[PDB]
Amino acid sequence: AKPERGRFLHFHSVTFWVGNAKQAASFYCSKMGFEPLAYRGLETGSREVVSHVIKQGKIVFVLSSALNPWNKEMGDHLVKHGDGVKDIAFEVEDCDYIVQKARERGAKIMREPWVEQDKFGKVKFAVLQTYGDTTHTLVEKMNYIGQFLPGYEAPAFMDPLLPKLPKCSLEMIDHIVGNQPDQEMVSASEWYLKNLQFHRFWSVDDTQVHTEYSSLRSIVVANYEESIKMPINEPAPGKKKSQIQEYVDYNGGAGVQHIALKTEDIITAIRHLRERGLEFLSVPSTYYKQLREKLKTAKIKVKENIDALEELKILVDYDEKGYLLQIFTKPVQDRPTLFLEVIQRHNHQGFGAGNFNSLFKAFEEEQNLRGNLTNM
Ligand SMILES: [Co+2]
């Protein structure tokens, strides 16, 4: 059923709470092909919080830290989670309706709709509490023509190394995954259905995604127009500990496990990301032998050179109409929590259990190296 009013247009931005915003922004710019977009801090009159905002295509990351000793909210979050996603922002139409509807359905409103303004126009915001300590910020632009948002100025520094690095060709945020503790997948996903009038887009249980040792369950929620997709995972039974449970152990609770970034040229993207020193998960040579064999009878034709995919360790999955190319980075911090994915879609707007399985297996290999694939 189509929601009466309101519309979630798309992912607006992801906000990270990190120990060192300056160095985090440098990491994402140099290693992942982002560029400075905006800044707030002591020099712009923001005296409690510093934010470095960076962008690639439509992808916008906000890296924020506390400026003062003993910041309780940001300090606690940092100690509990380490560097990680705090907020997922959605650009919306009719923020007021969305908030009112969410409130009536029982969502916790961390911040009532307020409006900010600069010379480029007005923006209305609201903040809702989702799983764990993660929030959603709703962004409604009211004839706003700025490059980002009110309260942020031009970048503090334009790193002269950046233009000398190869372009990574990342275009937009494709989906964002939230890991939940044991038995909280349903309640976490229902939150979207009930409060935001999302619907169930896809799901897998532990009989569809598992290795010889561990498994998960997942439900993907999506907005009506399906421009926003968010897999919600929980651990599931196995001889050994699910990687979802490893996440929860190290995150101290529910939170965002990965952000997938879409590209229209994944060969170029991964080659350039590797040249910049980004690390990715690995896949055995046998996978590509089996892949070539399977493609002989497939209804689709993969256009990327398989040798290149194999070289770059890109995973392939397909249905009868199209295919998906996906790859995970290693975690972007030392705790095995947050990582990133690069995805290219070819006439395929969903997810594939094939890739979900291979990715799950590729990640479980690293969980084992961390000594956390332990018997249950
Ligand atoms: Co993903």
Curated annotation (Swiss-Prot):
Residue numbers of N6-succinyllysine PTMs: K124
Record-annotated VOC domain positions: 10-141, 172-330
Keyword Transcription regulation attributed: no
Any one GO biological process: tyrosine catabolic process
Cellular component, GO annotation: cytosol; endoplasmic reticulum membrane; extracellular exosome; Golgi membrane
Subcellular location: Cytoplasm; Endoplasmic reticulum membrane; Golgi apparatus membrane
GO molecular function term, any single one: protein homodimerization activity
Names of the cofactor(s): Fe cation
Pathway listed: Amino-acid degradation; L-phenylalanine degradation; acetoacetate and fumarate from L-phenylalanine: step 3/6
Bound cofactor: record note: Binds 1 Fe cation per subunit.
Reaction(s) catalysed by this chain's protein: 3-(4-hydroxyphenyl)pyruvate + O2 = homogentisate + CO2
Family annotation (InterPro entries): 4OHPhenylPyrv_dOase, 4OHPhenylPyrv_dOase_C, 4OHPhenylPyrv_dOase_N, Glyas_Bleomycin-R_OHBP_Dase, Glyas_Fos-R_dOase_dom, VOC
Modification Phosphoserine occurs at: S203, S218, S242
Primary location recorded for the protein, binned into one broad class: cytoplasm
Pfam families in alphabetical order: Glyoxalase
Protein task: Catalyzes the conversion of 4-hydroxyphenylpyruvic acid to homogentisic acid, one of the steps in tyrosine catabolism.
Family stated for the protein in its record: Belongs to the 4HPPD family.
Subunit structure: Homodimer.
Annotated disease: Tyrosinemia 3: An inborn error of metabolism characterized by elevations of tyrosine in the blood and urine, seizures and mild intellectual disability. Hawkinsinuria: An inborn error of tyrosine metabolism characterized by failure to thrive, persistent metabolic acidosis, fine and sparse hair, and excretion of the unusual cyclic amino acid metabolite, hawkinsin, in the urine.
The name this protein goes by in its record: 4-hydroxyphenylpyruvate dioxygenase
Record organism: Homo sapiens
